[PDB]
Design a binder for this molecule. Structure first.
Ligand SMILES: CC(=O)N[C@@H](Cc1ccccc1)C(=O)N[C@H](C(=O)N1C[C@H](O)C[C@H]1C(=O)NCc1ccc(-c2scnc2C)cc1)C(C)(C)C
Lengths: 86, 103, 141
C-alpha cells in the first residue's frame, strides 16, 4: 500500500504508506493523497529518501551511513522537517 | 540484496526497492500494481537505454551499493498510448534557491 | 547520579570508531563531571585501559552531536573473558531529519548569523540550542 505525496510544483511522489507515516503530520493529513503547498519537489524528493533511509536503518546492526544534505537545500529541508515532525 | 529506486515518468516518481536478482519484467509488475498499466504498455530505461524484460536489475547496473536508500537510482518509465510508445520524458525537480550570503 | 564507580578492577577496551565523525570519548568521573579523552579520527580504533563500572559516552568532537556506543547512549566496561578486550562500537545514530538539517545548517552558518536566516524564531532557538554533554546528562537524569 502506497500513498501519493504531491509537491508544490505538482510532482507526485508515490511511497509506501508505512514509510510516509514516519511523519506524524502526514499521518494526520491521511487519517491517500496529500498536497504540500509549501514544499517544492527538490525538497520533497529528499524527504522521501529520508523515509526510505530511516525505515531501512532503524533497529539495524549494519553500520549506518550519513544522511547527505546539499548546502543548497538545507534551509528549506529544515523547514519541511519541522512542519512534518520527522 | 535490496536496491532502492526512483521510477520516474513525467511528474510521477515511485520510491520502491527490489532485489538485485529480480528482473525488469518483475519491476514492471510492481509498477503495474501501483499505476494500473500492464507491463506490455511500459518501457523501462536506464538513462536512455531501453531495458530488456528478462534481465536482472544487477545486470543492468542497479546494485545494492549504488542504488541506496538515501540516494536511490533512477529508472525511467514510458507508457504506450494506445498503439505506439510515448518518448521517455522525465520532468526535472525544481531548482533550489541561491545560497544566502550567510551560508 | 551518573558517575563512574571507583572499582580498581582493570578492563581493556577497544574504542572502535565506525562513524564518519571525529569522535570525542567522554569519561564521567567519580563526581559525575564529564572528562574529555583524546579524539579518534573516522574509522580508527584505540586499545585503552579503563575499569569495570566506569561510564563512557561519545560525541562528535567538533559539534558535540550525540553518537551511539554499542547501540545505546552509555558504555560501561565489563569483565574481560579469557583476556579478550571489550569492543565499544561507536556509530552514527539515525538522526531525525530535523536534527540532521540543524547539523548541516550549523556547520554552514556562524552562530552570529543564525538571526539572519529567514525562519520561525523557534528554529533560531533550535539552532542555538547546540548539542551539549551537560544538557544530555540532565536529560539522562
Ligand atoms: C589513581 C588510580 O590509578 N585510580 C584508578 C583506580 C585504581 C586503580 C588501582 C589502584 C587504585 C585505584 C582509576 O580509576 N583511574 C582513572 C583511569 O585510569 N581512567 C579513567 C577511565 O576509566 C579511563 C582510565 C584512563 O584514564 N586510562 C588511560 C587512557 C588514556 C587514553 C585513552 C584514550 S581515549 C581515546 N584515545 C585514547 C588514547 C583512554 C584511557 C583515573 C586515573 C583517570 C582516575
Amino acid at each position: 500500500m502506497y500513498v501519493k505525496l504531491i509537491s508544490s510544483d505538482g510532482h507526485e511522489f508515490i511511497v509506501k504508506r508505512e514509510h510516509a507515516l514516519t511523519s506524524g503530520t502526514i499521518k494526520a493529513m491521511l487519517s491517500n493523497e496529500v498536497n504540500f503547498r509549501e514544499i517544492p519537489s527538490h525538497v520533497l524528493s529528499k524527504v522521501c529518501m529520508y523515509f526510505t533511509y530511516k525505515v531501512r536503518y532503524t533497529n539495524s546492526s549494519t553500520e549506518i551511513p550519513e544522511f547527505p544534505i546539499a548546502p543548497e537545500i538545507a534551509l528549506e529541508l529544515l523547514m519541511a522537517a519541522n512542519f512534518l515532525d520527522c | 540484496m535490496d536496491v532502492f529506486l526512483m521510477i520516474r515518468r513525467h511528474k510521477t516518481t515511485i520510491f520502491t526497492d527490489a532485489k538485485e536478482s529480480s528482473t525488469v519484467f518483475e519491476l514492471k509488475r510492481i509498477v503495474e500494481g501501483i499505476l494500473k498499466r500492464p507491463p506490455d504498455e511500459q518501457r523501462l530505461y536506464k538513462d536512455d537505454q531501453l531495458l530488456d524484460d528478462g534481465k536482472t536489475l544487477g545486470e543492468c547496473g542497479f546494485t545494492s551499493q549504488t542504488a541506496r536508500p538515501q540516494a536511490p537510482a533512477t529508472v525511467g518509465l514510458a507508457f504506450r498510448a494506445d498503439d505506439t510508445f510515448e518518448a521517455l520524458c522525465i520532468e526535472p525537480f525544481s531548482s533550489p534557491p541561491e545560497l544566502p550570503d550567510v551560508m | 547520579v551518573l558517575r563512574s564507580v571507583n572499582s580498581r578492577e582493570p578492563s581493556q577496551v577497544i574504542f572502535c570508531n565506525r562513524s564518519p565523525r571525529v569522535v570525542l570519548p567522554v569519561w564521567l568521573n567519580f563526581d559525575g563531571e564529564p572528562q574529555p579523552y583524546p579524539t579518534l579520527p573516522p574509522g580508527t580504533g584505540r586499545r585503552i585501559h579503563s575499569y569495570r563500572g566506569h561510564l563512557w559516552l561519545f560525541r562528535d568532537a567538533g559539534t558535540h552531536d550525540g553518537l551511539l556506543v554499542n547501540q545505546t547512549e552509555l558504555f560501561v566496561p565489563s569483565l574481560n573473558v579469557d583476556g579478550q578486550p571489550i569492543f565499544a562500537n561507536i556509530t552514527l545514530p539515525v538522526y531525525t531529519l530535523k536534527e540532521r538539517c540543524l547539523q548541516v545548517v550549523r556547520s554552514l552558518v556562524k552562530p552570529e548569523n543564525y538571526r539572519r536566516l529567514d525562519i520561525v524564531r523557534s528554529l533560531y532557538e533550535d539552532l542555538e540550542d547546540h548539542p551539549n554533554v551537560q544538557k544530555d546528562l540532565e536529560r539522562l537524569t
